[PDB]
Amino acid sequence: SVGLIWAQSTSGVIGRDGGIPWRLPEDLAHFKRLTMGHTVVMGRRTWDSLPAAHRPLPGRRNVVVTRQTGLVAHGAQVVGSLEQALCPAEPDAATWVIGGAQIYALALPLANRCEVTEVDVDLPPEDEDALAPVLDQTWAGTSGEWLVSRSGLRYRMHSYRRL
Ligand SMILES: NC(=O)c1ccc[n+]([C@@H]2O[C@H](COP(=O)([O-])OP(=O)(O)OC[C@H]3O[C@@H](n4cnc5c(N)ncnc54)[C@H](OP(=O)(O)O)[C@@H]3O)[C@@H](O)[C@H]2O)c1
Ligand SMILES: CCc1nc(N)nc(N)c1OCCCOc1cccc(CCC(=O)O)c1
Ligand SMILES: [Cl-]
């Protein structure tokens, strides 16, 4: 079972300028709760985007997908394709693909679950933005209530499963 987890603005933006263009502590807490103890698979750009105290993400098996031969990622396992990341020598009951846009597009056909945070922040897309995948009719989901963060942003969590 492979799941995707991401946070997006309502407009679909997930990344800008090498980072995430809002601050939402409640989403980071949700991400920690869903992923702790499990495998997290990410593209190399997302690995390079992690803040220092989160590189590697503590308490998870970190896997980094790159085409670079010989890349060392201290605290993570380096693999050469998403398929390799999903064929571990040591199986894990739960594997989460945690971004970014390039890796989500490769992972979506292989996944059966998506956990999405929607953030009500106005971000007209800009040309180098990383965008969320769009879930088609093969997916169905459920939505939590709109909540207000302690920092003031409206947000809500959606849970999708493959039909
Ligand atoms: N809001 C969220 O939930 C969320 C989550 C994660 C990331 N983000 C944001 O998203 C952005 C990063 O996303 P991104 O789309 O630019 O990059 P990405 O998907 O994280 O990483 C892209 C890299 O993955 C490797 N890769 C891609 N396709 C591959 C393939 N077929 N085989 C092997 N390796 C492959 C390449 O690494 P090499 O160049 O090393 O070969 C490529 O440069 C950042 O802004 C980050 O902050 C947001
Ligand atoms: C929490 C974002 C997130 N949220 C969900 N729901 N799914 C994800 N895959 C997801 O990204 C996980 C990879 C990035 O991890 C961190 C971890 C800690 C602090 C930051 C700040 C980024 C900034 O402020 O630029 C980023
Ligand atoms: Cl974390």
Could you please describe the fold and organization of this structure?
The chain has 163 residues and is of the alpha/beta class. The protein has one domain. Helices cover 17% and strands 33% of the residues. It contains four helices and eleven strands; from the N terminus they run ββαβαββαβαβββββ. Strands 1, 3, 4, 5, 6, 7, 9, 10 and 11 form a nine-stranded mixed sheet that branches. A two-stranded antiparallel sheet has the order 2-8. Strand 10 and strand 11 form a beta hairpin. It is globular, with a radius of gyration of 15 Å. The site of chloride ion has 3 residues, from loops. Chloride ion (CL) binds at residues 32, 54, 57.
Topology:
Layout: E1 2-9, E2 13-15, H1 25-35, E3 39-43, H2 44-49, E4 61-65, E5 77-79, H3 82-85, E6 95-97, H4 101-107, E7 113-120, E8 130-131, E9 139-143, E10 147-148, E11 154-162
Parallel strand pairs: 1-6, 1-7, 3-4, 3-6, 4-5
Antiparallel strand pairs: 2-8, 7-11, 9-11, 10-11
The site of ligand QKJ has 17 residues, from β1 and α1.
**Which range does the strand content fall in?**
25-35%
Number of domains: 1
Which secondary-structure class do the elements indicate?
A: alpha/beta
Question: Could you give the count of β-strands?
Answer: 11
Instruction: Note the main sheet.
Output: 9 strands, mixed
Report the bound ligands by name, code or SMILES: NADP nicotinamide-adenine-dinucleotide phosphate, the ligand CCc1nc(N)nc(N)c1OCCCOc1cccc(CCC(=O)O)c1, chloride ion
State the share of residues found in helices, binned by percent. 10-25%
Q: What is the CA-based Rg, rounded?
A: 15 Å
* Series of H and E elements: EEHEHEEHEHEEEEE
- From the spread of the alpha carbons, the general shape counts as globular
- End-to-end span in angstroms? 14 Å
Q: Helical segment tally? A: 4
PDB class: oxidoreductase/oxidoreductase inhibitor
Keywords: ssgcid, sddc, inhibitor, Structural Genomics, Seattle Structural Genomics Center for Infectious Disease, oxidoreductase, OXIDOREDUCTASE-OXIDOREDUCTASE INHIBITOR complex
Assembly: monomeric
Entry title: Crystal Structure of Dihydrofolate reductase (DHFR) from Mycobacterium ulcerans Agy99 in complex with NADP and inhibitor SDDC-0001565
